Design goal:
about 290 residues, 2 domains, five-stranded antiparallel sheet, Phosphorylase Kinase, domain 1, Kinase, Transferase(Phosphotransferase), domain 1, transferase
């Protein structure tokens, strides 16, 4: 069965060995699927990001197929570009664009963002989601961990391991995926859901940028999901540090009824996003500038 999956994925990925032009690998991250390394292009000296995933060490396994198939040619400014994919031994390697700024998680847990920087993040994410949702792609794992920055402060979306597709024939998904604290109520309740679950998850990420952590973060994962499922929409601990414009924006995000929840296209015109500053305003938040 292992060799059967190697042959199939082989027909999808690009032929050859990336080690022939890549040099000096070094781990900078690790996810549920695999590890992430910085590699140097031997010919030029430019840096890229490589995602190594051992085939005989995964659960669903077919989600490795998901990221590669769905995002093989996808191009967007606010989405981490996937250059090439290779089958190296028993591992799936994916060469992606390298975002030197690192993850947003390092920022929300060490420093505090102003509403200018928060709006800039939400604007970039909503720009990516609006295009993704329009083409029927749902991320289903939106959180500060999945958000990366460039060295000049541009925000991009990554980690499409849990992504899925919807259409006219099949408008709803049913799978239970994502990270517990960022999951939408209708997703936990095992109800047929759509792209609206990304909007809720984005609402939780706003709480991250304000409070530093998602709601019920101290509670066990299984316990927290029950709370999201049963209780009213989670509120900000630091509501007093939040302008009424951000509050109203958040109230359009954290709606239990998915039909009442605002879409990515609607939120792009929300008055709060008019406070979004340039990418240069996010630069002082990064670790090398503190």
């Amino acid at each position: 069965s292992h060799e059967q999956f190697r042959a199939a994925l082989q027909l999808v990925v690009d032929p050859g060995d990336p080690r022939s032009y890549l040099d000096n690998f070094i781990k900078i991250g690790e996810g549920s699927t695999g590890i992430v390394c910085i590699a140097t292009v031997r010919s030029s000296g430019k840096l890229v990001a490589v995602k190594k995933m051992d085939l005989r060490k995964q659960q669903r396994r077919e989600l490795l197929f998901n990221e590669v198939v769905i995002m093989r040619d996808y191009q967007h400014e606010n989405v981490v570009e996937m250059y090439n994919s290779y089958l190296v031994g028993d591992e799936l390697w994916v060469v992606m664009e390298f975002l030197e700024g690192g993850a947003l998680t390092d920022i929300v847990t060490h420093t505090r963002m102003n509403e200018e920087q928060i709006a800039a993040v939400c604007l970039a994410v909503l720009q990516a989601l609006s295009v993704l949702h329009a083409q029927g792609v749902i991320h289903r794992d939106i959180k500060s961990d999945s958000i990366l920055l460039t060295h000049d402060g541009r925000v991009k979306l990554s980690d499409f391991g849990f992504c899925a597709q919807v259409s006219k024939e099949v408008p709803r998904r049913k799978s239970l995926v994502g990270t517990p604290y960022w999951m939408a109520p209708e997703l936990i309740s095992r109800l047929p859901y759509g792209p609206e679950v990304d909007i809720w998850s984005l609402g939780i990420m706003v709480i991250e940028m304000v409070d530093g952590e998602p709601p019920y973060f101290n509670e066990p994962p299984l316990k927290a999901m029950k709370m999201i499922r049963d209780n009213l929409p989670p509120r900000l601990k630091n509501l007093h540090k939040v302008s009424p414009s951000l509050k109203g924006f958040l109230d359009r995000l954290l709606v239990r009824d998915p039909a009442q929840r605002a879409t990515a296209a609607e939120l792009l015109k929300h008055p709060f996003l008019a406070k979004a500053g340039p990418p240069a305003s996010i630069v002082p938040l990064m670790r090398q500038n503190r």
